[PDB]
Short mmCIF file of C-alpha atoms and ligand atoms in Angstrom, two decimals:
data_model
loop_
_atom_site.label_atom_id
_atom_site.label_comp_id
_atom_site.label_asym_id
_atom_site.label_seq_id
_atom_site.Cartn_x
_atom_site.Cartn_y
_atom_site.Cartn_z
CA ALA U 1 98.24 67.97 94.68
CA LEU U 2 96.80 71.46 95.15
CA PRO U 3 93.31 70.98 94.10
CA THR U 4 92.57 73.81 91.99
CA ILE U 5 90.29 76.91 92.42
CA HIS U 6 87.38 77.40 89.77
CA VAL U 7 86.35 81.39 90.27
CA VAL U 8 83.33 81.36 88.59
CA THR U 9 82.80 85.39 87.36
CA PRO U 10 79.75 86.83 85.56
CA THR U 11 80.68 89.57 84.16
CA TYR U 12 79.27 91.89 81.65
CA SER U 13 80.08 95.20 79.42
CA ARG U 14 80.12 98.71 80.91
CA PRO U 15 82.24 101.77 81.99
CA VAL U 16 84.02 99.83 84.66
CA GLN U 17 84.36 96.84 84.21
CA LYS U 18 87.93 96.59 83.23
CA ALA U 19 88.80 98.30 85.99
CA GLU U 20 87.23 95.20 87.20
CA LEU U 21 88.62 92.40 86.02
CA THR U 22 92.62 94.65 86.23
CA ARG U 23 91.88 94.95 89.81
CA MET U 24 90.39 91.31 90.37
CA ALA U 25 93.25 89.50 87.61
CA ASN U 26 95.84 92.21 90.41
CA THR U 27 94.14 90.09 93.52
CA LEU U 28 94.02 86.52 91.24
CA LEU U 29 97.85 86.11 89.96
CA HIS U 30 98.93 86.17 93.38
CA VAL U 31 96.99 82.29 94.32
CA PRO U 32 98.65 79.60 92.92
CA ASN U 33 96.28 76.96 90.96
CA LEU U 34 93.43 78.64 90.20
CA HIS U 35 91.42 78.43 86.66
CA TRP U 36 89.28 81.61 85.83
CA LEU U 37 86.47 80.87 84.95
CA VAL U 38 84.96 84.02 83.14
CA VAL U 39 81.33 84.48 81.63
CA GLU U 40 80.63 87.29 79.61
CA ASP U 41 76.05 88.85 80.01
CA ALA U 42 76.69 88.67 76.17
CA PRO U 43 76.09 87.29 72.92
CA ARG U 44 79.64 86.36 72.27
CA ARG U 45 82.65 87.01 73.15
CA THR U 46 83.89 90.34 73.76
CA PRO U 47 87.66 92.01 72.18
CA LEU U 48 87.49 93.39 75.89
CA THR U 49 87.68 90.27 77.81
CA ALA U 50 89.12 88.46 75.41
CA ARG U 51 92.48 90.82 75.34
CA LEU U 52 92.68 91.55 79.07
CA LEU U 53 92.62 87.55 79.92
CA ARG U 54 95.35 86.57 77.53
CA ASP U 55 97.63 89.06 78.84
CA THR U 56 97.13 88.56 82.13
CA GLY U 57 99.09 84.85 81.13
CA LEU U 58 96.04 83.16 84.30
CA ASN U 59 95.03 79.98 83.20
CA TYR U 60 91.01 81.05 82.28
CA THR U 61 87.91 79.59 80.22
CA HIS U 62 86.80 82.09 78.86
CA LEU U 63 82.34 81.87 78.16
CA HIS U 64 79.18 84.01 77.79
CA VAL U 65 75.61 83.43 77.37
CA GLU U 66 72.75 85.84 77.44
CA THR U 67 70.06 87.30 79.55
CA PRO U 68 67.08 87.66 78.18
CA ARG U 81 62.89 89.43 88.53
CA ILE U 82 65.94 87.25 88.65
CA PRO U 83 69.12 87.39 90.53
CA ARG U 84 72.18 89.14 88.78
CA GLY U 85 74.36 86.59 86.70
CA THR U 86 72.55 83.73 87.13
CA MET U 87 72.84 82.27 83.45
CA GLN U 88 76.65 82.84 83.40
CA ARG U 89 77.46 81.00 86.71
CA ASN U 90 74.90 78.08 86.16
CA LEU U 91 76.74 77.99 82.46
CA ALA U 92 79.17 77.91 83.88
CA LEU U 93 78.00 74.63 86.25
CA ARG U 94 77.07 73.42 83.30
CA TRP U 95 80.93 73.85 81.28
CA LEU U 96 82.10 72.45 84.57
CA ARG U 97 80.09 69.01 84.16
CA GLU U 98 80.78 68.95 80.73
CA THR U 99 84.47 68.72 81.59
CA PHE U 100 85.44 67.14 84.20
CA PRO U 101 84.25 63.94 85.31
CA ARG U 102 82.01 62.66 88.48
CA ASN U 103 84.26 60.30 89.76
CA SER U 104 86.97 62.30 88.61
CA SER U 105 90.87 62.11 90.05
CA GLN U 106 91.68 66.16 89.32
CA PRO U 107 90.34 67.83 92.91
CA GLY U 108 89.11 71.14 92.61
CA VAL U 109 87.44 74.01 94.65
CA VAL U 110 84.38 76.17 93.35
CA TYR U 111 84.04 79.22 93.91
CA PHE U 112 81.44 82.07 92.75
CA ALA U 113 83.00 85.62 92.45
CA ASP U 114 81.62 88.76 91.26
CA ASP U 115 83.35 91.53 89.83
CA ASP U 116 83.18 93.50 92.23
CA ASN U 117 83.82 92.42 95.02
CA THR U 118 86.68 92.57 97.08
CA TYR U 119 88.78 89.41 97.81
CA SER U 120 91.44 88.89 100.26
CA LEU U 121 94.45 86.44 99.35
CA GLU U 122 93.42 84.59 103.22
CA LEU U 123 90.65 83.58 101.01
CA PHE U 124 91.70 81.19 99.56
CA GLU U 125 93.61 79.66 101.59
CA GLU U 126 91.26 79.34 102.91
CA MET U 127 88.90 77.81 100.96
CA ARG U 128 91.10 74.99 99.39
CA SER U 129 90.41 72.33 101.74
CA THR U 130 87.85 72.97 101.67
CA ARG U 131 85.86 69.52 102.04
CA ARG U 132 82.21 69.70 100.98
CA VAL U 133 80.96 73.30 101.24
CA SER U 134 82.83 75.86 103.01
CA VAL U 135 81.25 79.34 104.90
CA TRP U 136 82.48 82.60 105.99
CA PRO U 137 81.17 86.11 107.33
CA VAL U 138 81.02 88.25 104.09
CA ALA U 139 81.35 92.23 104.40
CA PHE U 140 78.47 94.92 103.85
CA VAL U 141 75.96 92.04 103.01
CA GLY U 142 72.54 92.39 104.20
CA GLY U 143 72.00 95.38 105.38
CA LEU U 144 74.98 95.33 108.11
CA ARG U 145 78.56 96.06 108.16
CA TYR U 146 78.36 92.00 107.59
CA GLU U 147 76.94 88.63 107.57
CA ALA U 148 78.16 85.40 109.41
CA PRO U 149 76.89 82.23 109.55
CA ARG U 150 76.89 80.95 113.32
CA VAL U 151 79.03 78.01 114.99
CA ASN U 152 78.65 76.43 118.23
CA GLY U 153 82.23 75.68 120.72
CA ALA U 154 82.26 71.94 118.34
CA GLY U 155 82.61 74.64 115.20
CA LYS U 156 79.41 73.56 113.22
CA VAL U 157 77.08 75.72 111.11
CA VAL U 158 73.44 75.63 113.67
CA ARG U 159 72.11 78.84 112.42
CA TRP U 160 72.97 82.49 110.51
CA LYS U 161 73.53 86.48 111.71
CA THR U 162 71.90 87.55 109.78
CA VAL U 163 68.81 89.96 109.78
CA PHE U 164 67.28 89.29 106.30
CA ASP U 165 64.97 86.73 107.22
CA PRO U 166 68.29 84.36 108.66
CA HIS U 167 66.06 81.85 108.60
CA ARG U 168 66.75 81.32 105.12
CA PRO U 169 67.77 77.37 104.68
CA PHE U 170 71.66 79.50 103.86
CA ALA U 171 71.18 83.03 104.85
CA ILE U 172 74.76 83.80 102.91
CA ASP U 173 75.95 85.75 100.80
CA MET U 174 76.92 84.50 96.39
CA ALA U 175 80.97 84.83 97.88
CA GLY U 176 80.48 83.53 101.31
CA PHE U 177 80.10 80.05 100.47
CA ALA U 178 82.92 77.41 98.26
CA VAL U 179 81.67 73.84 96.83
CA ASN U 180 83.78 70.83 96.21
CA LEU U 181 83.85 70.01 92.23
CA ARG U 182 83.52 66.51 93.46
CA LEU U 183 79.43 67.70 95.03
CA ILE U 184 78.93 70.15 91.81
CA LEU U 185 79.24 66.50 89.51
CA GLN U 186 77.46 64.83 91.73
CA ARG U 187 74.91 66.60 91.22
CA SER U 188 75.37 66.88 88.26
CA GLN U 189 71.29 68.70 87.65
CA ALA U 190 71.83 71.02 90.61
CA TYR U 191 71.78 74.62 89.54
CA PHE U 192 70.85 78.65 90.54
CA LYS U 193 66.93 79.03 90.70
CA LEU U 194 66.38 81.67 87.57
CA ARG U 195 61.73 81.17 87.77
CA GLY U 196 60.49 81.17 91.55
CA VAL U 197 62.64 82.85 93.06
CA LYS U 198 62.19 84.19 96.02
CA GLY U 199 64.36 87.36 97.78
CA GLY U 200 67.39 86.44 98.67
CA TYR U 201 66.88 82.65 98.44
CA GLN U 202 69.32 82.07 94.86
CA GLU U 203 71.99 81.47 97.07
CA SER U 204 69.85 78.56 99.43
CA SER U 205 67.90 76.44 95.54
CA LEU U 206 71.69 75.37 94.87
CA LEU U 207 72.91 74.67 98.64
CA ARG U 208 70.18 72.61 99.64
CA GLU U 209 70.99 70.19 96.96
CA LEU U 210 73.64 70.11 97.32
CA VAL U 211 74.49 69.88 101.52
CA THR U 212 73.29 70.13 104.77
CA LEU U 213 73.15 72.83 107.38
CA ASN U 214 75.58 70.89 109.57
CA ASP U 215 78.05 69.32 107.31
CA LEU U 216 79.36 73.05 106.50
CA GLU U 217 82.68 73.67 107.11
CA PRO U 218 83.21 76.85 108.87
CA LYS U 219 86.06 79.25 107.80
CA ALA U 220 88.11 82.80 109.05
CA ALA U 221 88.89 81.89 112.47
CA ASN U 222 85.10 79.73 112.81
CA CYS U 223 83.70 82.62 111.26
CA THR U 224 84.61 85.26 113.13
CA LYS U 225 86.89 87.75 110.74
CA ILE U 226 85.70 88.68 107.41
CA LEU U 227 87.91 87.53 104.66
CA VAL U 228 85.59 88.95 101.82
CA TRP U 229 84.20 92.21 101.68
CA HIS U 230 80.98 93.17 99.43
CA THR U 231 81.97 96.08 97.80
CA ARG U 232 79.75 97.72 95.17
CA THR U 233 81.87 100.11 92.60
CA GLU U 234 79.74 103.87 91.61
CA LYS U 235 78.79 104.02 88.60
CA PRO U 236 80.82 106.37 86.27
CA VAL U 237 79.59 111.10 85.47
CA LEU U 238 79.74 110.38 81.66
CA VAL U 239 77.81 114.04 81.10
CA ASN U 240 80.66 116.40 80.06
CA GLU U 241 80.22 113.84 76.50
CA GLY U 242 77.69 115.48 75.45
CA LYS U 243 75.29 113.52 73.15
CA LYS U 244 78.00 113.82 70.28
CA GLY U 245 80.75 111.68 72.51
CA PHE U 246 83.96 114.28 73.16
CA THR U 247 86.51 111.01 73.41
CA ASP U 248 87.93 109.17 71.22
CA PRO U 249 85.51 106.07 71.43
CA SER U 250 88.39 103.30 69.54
CA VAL U 251 89.68 104.21 72.98
CA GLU U 252 89.52 101.29 74.97
CA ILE U 253 88.39 102.00 79.03
CA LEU Y 2 115.39 100.20 89.23
CA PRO Y 3 114.18 103.38 89.61
CA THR Y 4 112.20 102.89 93.96
CA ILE Y 5 108.37 104.69 92.94
CA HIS Y 6 107.34 106.19 96.63
CA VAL Y 7 103.89 106.57 96.24
CA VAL Y 8 102.03 108.63 98.32
CA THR Y 9 98.77 106.88 100.11
CA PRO Y 10 96.26 109.89 101.75
CA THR Y 11 93.69 107.14 103.90
CA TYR Y 12 90.53 107.81 106.60
CA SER Y 13 88.97 105.25 108.55
CA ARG Y 14 85.47 104.56 106.86
CA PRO Y 15 84.11 100.86 106.59
CA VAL Y 16 85.39 100.44 102.79
CA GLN Y 17 88.91 100.82 103.96
CA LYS Y 18 90.16 97.61 105.18
CA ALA Y 19 88.64 96.48 102.41
CA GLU Y 20 90.38 99.10 99.59
CA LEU Y 21 93.77 99.02 101.26
CA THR Y 22 92.64 95.52 100.34
CA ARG Y 23 92.68 95.49 97.04
CA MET Y 24 95.58 98.45 96.12
CA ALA Y 25 97.84 96.81 98.44
CA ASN Y 26 97.06 92.79 96.15
CA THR Y 27 97.70 95.20 93.81
CA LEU Y 28 100.88 97.16 95.11
CA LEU Y 29 102.38 93.98 95.89
CA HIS Y 30 103.26 92.94 92.37
CA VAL Y 31 105.02 95.75 91.75
CA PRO Y 32 109.34 95.30 92.64
CA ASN Y 33 111.25 98.33 94.18
CA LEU Y 34 107.80 100.37 95.52
CA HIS Y 35 107.84 102.00 98.37
CA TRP Y 36 104.91 102.86 100.35
CA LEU Y 37 103.97 105.86 101.88
CA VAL Y 38 101.09 105.67 103.89
CA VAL Y 39 99.40 108.50 105.02
CA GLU Y 40 96.19 108.34 107.22
CA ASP Y 41 93.96 111.59 108.19
CA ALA Y 42 93.90 109.89 111.70
CA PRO Y 43 95.52 111.78 115.55
CA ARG Y 44 96.98 108.52 115.89
CA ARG Y 45 97.62 105.48 113.20
CA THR Y 46 95.30 103.06 113.81
CA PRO Y 47 95.06 99.50 114.69
CA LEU Y 48 93.63 98.21 111.68
CA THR Y 49 96.49 100.31 108.81
CA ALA Y 50 99.34 99.17 111.17
CA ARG Y 51 97.76 95.20 110.96
CA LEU Y 52 97.08 95.57 107.95
CA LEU Y 53 100.86 96.78 106.67
CA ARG Y 54 102.67 94.74 108.37
CA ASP Y 55 101.10 91.91 107.02
CA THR Y 56 101.81 92.72 103.60
CA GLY Y 57 104.60 92.51 103.50
CA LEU Y 58 105.48 95.75 101.13
CA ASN Y 59 107.82 98.03 102.28
CA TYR Y 60 106.49 101.11 103.60
CA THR Y 61 105.88 104.42 105.60
CA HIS Y 62 102.47 104.44 107.73
CA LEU Y 63 102.28 108.03 108.67
CA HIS Y 64 100.10 110.26 110.37
CA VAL Y 65 98.33 113.72 110.04
CA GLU Y 66 94.92 114.39 111.18
CA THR Y 67 93.35 117.50 109.20
CA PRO Y 68 90.84 119.21 111.79
CA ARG Y 69 87.71 118.57 112.45
CA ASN Y 70 86.80 122.63 111.57
CA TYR Y 71 88.17 121.73 108.35
CA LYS Y 72 85.92 119.18 107.06
CA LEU Y 73 83.23 121.24 108.17
CA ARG Y 81 87.48 124.55 99.69
CA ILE Y 82 90.01 122.05 100.80
CA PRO Y 83 90.51 118.71 98.92
CA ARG Y 84 90.24 115.36 100.79
CA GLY Y 85 93.95 114.38 101.49
CA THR Y 86 95.94 117.66 100.52
CA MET Y 87 97.19 117.75 104.04
CA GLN Y 88 97.84 113.92 103.49
CA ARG Y 89 99.96 113.84 100.72
CA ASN Y 90 101.75 117.78 102.07
CA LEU Y 91 102.57 115.76 105.06
CA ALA Y 92 104.53 112.89 102.92
CA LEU Y 93 106.05 115.92 100.80
CA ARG Y 94 107.70 116.90 104.29
CA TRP Y 95 108.59 113.19 104.80
CA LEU Y 96 110.27 112.43 101.48
CA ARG Y 97 112.18 116.26 101.83
CA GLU Y 98 113.47 115.86 105.73
CA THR Y 99 114.34 111.93 104.63
CA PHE Y 100 116.61 112.60 101.18
CA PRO Y 101 119.00 115.40 101.21
CA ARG Y 102 118.76 117.74 98.49
CA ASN Y 103 121.18 116.39 96.65
CA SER Y 104 121.15 112.60 96.99
CA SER Y 105 121.93 111.47 94.20
CA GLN Y 106 119.11 108.70 94.55
CA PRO Y 107 117.07 107.62 91.44
CA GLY Y 108 112.95 107.74 92.79
CA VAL Y 109 109.53 108.92 91.29
CA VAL Y 110 106.96 109.99 93.60
CA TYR Y 111 103.00 109.40 92.92
CA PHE Y 112 99.85 110.68 94.99
CA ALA Y 113 97.94 106.96 94.63
CA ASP Y 114 94.13 107.87 96.19
CA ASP Y 115 93.55 104.79 97.67
CA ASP Y 116 90.22 103.66 95.61
CA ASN Y 117 91.35 104.46 91.94
CA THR Y 118 92.17 100.86 90.37
CA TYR Y 119 95.72 101.11 88.70
CA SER Y 120 97.05 98.25 86.35
CA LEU Y 121 100.40 97.23 86.80
CA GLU Y 122 101.93 98.68 82.51
CA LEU Y 123 101.13 102.06 84.43
CA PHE Y 124 104.11 101.51 87.07
CA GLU Y 125 106.45 101.12 85.10
CA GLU Y 126 105.75 103.33 82.83
CA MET Y 127 106.18 105.93 85.30
CA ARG Y 128 109.76 103.97 86.87
CA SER Y 129 111.10 105.98 83.86
CA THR Y 130 110.43 109.34 84.89
CA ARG Y 131 113.31 112.31 84.56
CA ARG Y 132 111.20 115.52 85.36
CA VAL Y 133 107.48 115.12 85.76
CA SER Y 134 105.39 112.31 83.72
CA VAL Y 135 101.59 112.01 82.10
CA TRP Y 136 99.16 109.71 81.12
CA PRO Y 137 95.08 109.60 80.14
CA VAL Y 138 93.00 108.97 83.19
CA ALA Y 139 90.05 107.07 82.93
CA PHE Y 140 86.59 108.87 84.77
CA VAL Y 141 87.74 111.85 85.13
CA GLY Y 142 86.06 115.58 84.08
CA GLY Y 143 82.60 114.17 83.61
CA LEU Y 144 84.24 112.38 80.34
CA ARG Y 145 84.86 107.90 79.95
CA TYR Y 146 89.09 109.74 80.27
CA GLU Y 147 91.18 112.82 80.47
CA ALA Y 148 93.79 112.68 78.56
CA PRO Y 149 97.44 114.85 77.46
CA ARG Y 150 97.69 116.12 73.65
CA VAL Y 151 100.21 115.48 72.05
CA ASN Y 152 102.74 117.29 69.43
CA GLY Y 153 104.99 115.91 66.95
CA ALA Y 154 108.18 116.84 68.89
CA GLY Y 155 106.56 114.21 70.98
CA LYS Y 156 106.56 118.19 73.77
CA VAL Y 157 102.32 118.22 75.86
CA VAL Y 158 100.97 120.96 74.40
CA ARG Y 159 97.30 121.40 75.46
CA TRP Y 160 94.60 118.67 77.28
CA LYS Y 161 91.83 116.91 75.73
CA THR Y 162 89.11 117.29 78.09
CA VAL Y 163 85.96 119.89 78.25
CA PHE Y 164 86.26 121.31 82.12
CA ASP Y 165 89.25 124.17 82.12
CA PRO Y 166 91.04 122.39 79.46
CA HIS Y 167 93.31 125.50 79.33
CA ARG Y 168 94.39 126.03 83.61
CA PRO Y 169 97.78 125.57 83.74
CA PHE Y 170 97.42 121.36 84.19
CA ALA Y 171 94.15 119.81 83.06
CA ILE Y 172 94.97 116.56 85.25
CA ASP Y 173 94.13 114.48 87.93
CA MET Y 174 95.55 113.22 90.43
CA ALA Y 175 96.44 109.81 89.12
CA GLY Y 176 97.30 110.89 85.86
CA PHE Y 177 100.67 112.32 86.97
CA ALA Y 178 104.17 110.75 88.86
CA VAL Y 179 107.64 113.18 90.05
CA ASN Y 180 111.19 112.92 89.75
CA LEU Y 181 112.38 112.73 93.05
CA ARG Y 182 114.75 114.63 92.81
CA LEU Y 183 112.41 117.60 91.77
CA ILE Y 184 110.57 117.80 94.64
CA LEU Y 185 114.00 117.41 97.01
CA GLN Y 186 114.91 120.77 94.46
CA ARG Y 187 111.72 122.50 94.97
CA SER Y 188 111.41 122.43 98.59
CA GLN Y 189 109.50 125.07 98.60
CA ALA Y 190 106.47 123.64 96.46
CA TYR Y 191 102.71 122.00 97.85
CA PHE Y 192 99.75 121.35 97.48
CA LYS Y 193 97.60 124.52 97.86
CA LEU Y 194 96.10 123.96 101.09
CA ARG Y 195 92.78 125.95 100.98
CA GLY Y 196 91.50 128.61 98.59
CA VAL Y 197 91.80 125.98 95.82
CA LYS Y 198 89.85 126.96 93.27
CA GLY Y 199 87.53 123.56 92.33
CA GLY Y 200 90.28 121.68 89.39
CA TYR Y 201 93.31 123.22 90.51
CA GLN Y 202 95.15 121.29 92.74
CA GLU Y 203 96.94 119.06 90.96
CA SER Y 204 98.21 123.08 88.79
CA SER Y 205 99.10 124.18 92.51
CA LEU Y 206 101.80 121.74 92.84
CA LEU Y 207 103.03 120.94 89.06
CA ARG Y 208 103.23 125.40 88.04
CA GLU Y 209 106.21 125.04 90.23
CA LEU Y 210 107.89 121.45 89.65
CA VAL Y 211 107.56 121.96 85.43
CA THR Y 212 106.37 123.79 82.63
CA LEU Y 213 103.87 121.86 80.00
CA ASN Y 214 107.09 121.63 78.25
CA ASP Y 215 109.38 119.35 80.01
CA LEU Y 216 106.49 116.84 80.82
CA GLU Y 217 106.79 113.44 79.72
CA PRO Y 218 103.84 111.80 77.72
CA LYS Y 219 103.48 107.45 78.90
CA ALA Y 220 101.30 105.22 77.90
CA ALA Y 221 101.69 104.74 74.34
CA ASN Y 222 102.03 108.88 74.46
CA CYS Y 223 98.73 109.27 75.76
CA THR Y 224 96.96 106.93 73.78
CA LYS Y 225 96.47 104.01 76.65
CA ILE Y 226 93.82 104.30 79.37
CA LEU Y 227 96.58 102.46 82.30
CA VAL Y 228 94.69 103.99 85.47
CA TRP Y 229 91.13 104.04 85.91
CA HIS Y 230 88.92 107.06 88.67
CA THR Y 231 86.50 104.27 90.32
CA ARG Y 232 84.98 105.02 92.96
CA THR Y 233 83.80 103.21 96.26
CA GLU Y 234 80.11 103.39 97.17
CA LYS Y 235 78.98 103.53 100.81
CA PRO Y 236 77.50 100.09 102.21
CA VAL Y 237 73.98 99.98 103.56
CA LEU Y 238 73.88 99.97 106.55
CA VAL Y 239 70.12 100.78 107.70
CA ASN Y 240 69.91 96.56 109.62
CA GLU Y 241 72.53 97.67 112.49
CA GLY Y 242 69.48 99.42 114.06
CA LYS Y 243 70.96 102.21 116.38
CA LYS Y 244 71.80 99.77 119.39
CA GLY Y 245 73.84 98.15 116.86
CA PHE Y 246 73.72 94.55 115.63
CA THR Y 247 77.03 93.10 114.57
CA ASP Y 248 80.37 93.19 116.94
CA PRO Y 249 82.18 96.15 116.30
CA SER Y 250 84.72 94.16 117.77
CA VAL Y 251 85.09 92.05 114.64
CA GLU Y 252 86.84 94.86 111.95
CA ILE Y 253 86.02 95.17 108.36
O1 UDP P 301 73.48 92.24 83.74
C1 UDP P 301 74.95 91.61 84.46
C2 UDP P 301 74.44 93.50 85.66
C3 UDP P 301 75.50 92.19 86.30
N1 UDP P 301 76.55 91.10 86.22
C4 UDP P 301 77.94 90.22 86.94
O2 UDP P 301 76.95 89.36 88.11
C5 UDP P 301 77.42 90.27 88.97
C6 UDP P 301 76.44 89.99 90.17
O3 UDP P 301 76.59 91.80 90.60
P1 UDP P 301 76.06 93.18 90.65
O4 UDP P 301 74.94 93.59 90.44
O5 UDP P 301 77.33 93.64 91.72
O6 UDP P 301 75.66 92.50 92.20
P2 UDP P 301 75.02 93.05 93.61
O7 UDP P 301 76.98 93.55 94.24
O8 UDP P 301 74.36 94.30 92.83
O9 UDP P 301 74.39 92.27 93.78
C7 UDP P 301 78.41 90.77 88.49
O10 UDP P 301 80.04 89.48 88.32
C8 UDP P 301 78.30 90.81 87.69
O11 UDP P 301 79.92 91.44 86.73
C9 UDP P 301 75.56 90.57 84.88
O12 UDP P 301 76.62 89.19 84.10
N2 UDP P 301 74.90 91.34 83.64
O1 UDP P 302 88.42 112.78 105.22
C1 UDP P 302 89.04 112.87 104.13
C2 UDP P 302 88.81 111.82 102.85
C3 UDP P 302 89.27 111.78 101.61
N1 UDP P 302 90.32 110.75 102.45
C4 UDP P 302 91.38 110.61 101.31
O2 UDP P 302 91.71 111.26 100.10
C5 UDP P 302 91.81 110.87 98.97
C6 UDP P 302 90.63 111.69 98.87
O3 UDP P 302 89.59 110.42 97.83
P1 UDP P 302 88.35 111.09 97.24
O4 UDP P 302 87.63 111.42 98.33
O5 UDP P 302 88.15 109.58 96.83
O6 UDP P 302 88.46 111.90 96.56
P2 UDP P 302 87.34 111.70 94.53
O7 UDP P 302 87.59 110.01 94.28
O8 UDP P 302 85.96 112.13 95.81
O9 UDP P 302 88.45 112.72 94.05
C7 UDP P 302 91.69 108.96 99.01
O10 UDP P 302 92.91 108.43 98.72
C8 UDP P 302 90.48 109.15 100.40
O11 UDP P 302 90.86 107.95 100.91
C9 UDP P 302 91.03 111.75 103.03
O12 UDP P 302 92.76 111.05 104.20
N2 UDP P 302 90.86 112.15 104.65
MN1 MN P 303 78.43 93.02 93.01
MN1 MN P 304 88.61 108.80 94.70
#
C-alpha cells in the first residue's frame, strides 16, 4: 500500500561520478518502496553505472540519452517522464510519487517520508540555492502556500529548486504532454515550466513542518585536481574510480 | 565482529549538517560501528548533539577547540584526532584484549560499505587505494608477490615512510593502546607527512596489511564540498538565522 517513490536522477561521466552515486545509493538503500530511475547523459549505458546499480540490489531502471543554454539534466529528466508514461497507464492503480533528485545533492531520510504521502504536488525548503542559506515556500497560518521566500525572481510561478518538490505520479500520467522546457528557458524558470502545467499554487502541499525545516541540501562537489597524472597519465586507466 | 571506531573531526560551517547527514546515512549500514565525533569547538553544539542522537548510531560525542591562534603548519582536525586517540587510551585498558579497529574518517570523504568490511579484520595496520589525493585519480600502496607492501604508487614524495592519505589506513585498537605515546604531529609537519608521523611509531612497512583486492580497487574517495554562495543574504541577512541548516 505504501506509495512507490520514483527517484529521477540524471547523471554523467566525470571523475567524482562513482563517489556521488555511491553515497546517494547508501542513502536510498534506507528507503522502502523506492524505484531509482537513473538516466545517463551519454550515447549509451556505461558499465560503471550498470555495475554499481546492479550491486546495490536496489530496484532501478537504467536509461540513457545524450545532450546534443538548457539546464543540466533536462533531456534526461524528460526521458524519465516519457518512460513513466509509457510504463504506467493514465488511470492506473499503482500509487506513486515522482521526485527529481540530482546526483550531487544531500538528502535526509525524513525527506522521503515527507514526500511519500504527496496527493498532488508537495514542496519544502531547499538549502544552498538562490544565493541563500535556503529558499522556502511561504505558507500562511492555514497551511497554504501563498508565495516564495527567495531573493532571485521571487515572483516566478514556482520559485523553487528541482530538489524542493515531488509530484503524485497520477498527475504526471494525466498531463501526458507536460515536459521540462528546453527551448525558451528563462533563468530559473524550468521548474515552473513543468509545475505550471500540473498544479496551482493553492493546491501545493507544504512539507517539513509547514516549510520551517531543511531536509535537503543543494551541495556541490569540488572538481578533483589531477595535475600529477601529466599528459601521459600516471595511474592505471583500467582501474575504475 | 570487531568494533570499528570511526574518528571524525568536524567543525561548524554551512555544509556541516549536510556532510554529517550523508555520512551518517552510510555509517548506519555498518554493524558494530562506534562513531567518535570530535567537534572543533569550545563546547558540544546543539546541532551535532541532536543529529547524533537522532541517527540511532552508537556514538561518543567529544570536543576540543583548536586554538584560534593555531588557525591563523597544523593540519586540519589534528587536535581532534589526537583527542580521540587519548580518549581511546583512557577508556580501554592497555591489555583490553577487546577486538577493535580505529579509522580516521574526515566528514567530507565518500565511503563505500565494502571499505568497512575490508578494514574490520585489521591485525596491525591495513592500507588501501584512495581516490582524489596527491593530484592523482588515486594513490595506491604497491605490493610484492609475497603480499607485503613494498612502496607507494604516488607522484608526490612516493619515498616517504608512508605515502598515504588519512582515509587510506586503519589501525588495530590494541596497537593504539600498546603504543600509548603515539599521536599525530601537531605542528612543523612537512606537507603530506602527518600520516607517517603516527604510522612510523606504530608499524613497519613489512607489517602492513594490503586490502581492497590487494590494493587494486578504489573503495573510498577524497571528495571535497564546494562552499555555498550566500551573496543574496546581504549584510543584514535574509533568511532566519534560527532555522538550522
Ligand atoms: O552534462 C551534464 C551536467 C550535469 N548532469 C546531471 O544533471 C544534474 C544537474 O546538476 P549539476 O550541474 O550539479 O547541477 P547544479 O548543482 O550545477 O545546478 C545532476 O544530476 C548531474 O549529474 C548531466 O546529466 N549532464
Ligand atoms: O578548522 C577546521 C577545518 C577542518 N576540520 C575537520 O578536519 C578534517 C579536515 O578536512 P578538510 O579540510 O576537508 O580537509 P581536506 O580535504 O582539505 O584535506 C574534516 O573532517 C573537517 O571537518 C576541523 O575539525 N576544523
Ligand atoms: Mn547539483
Ligand atoms: Mn576533506
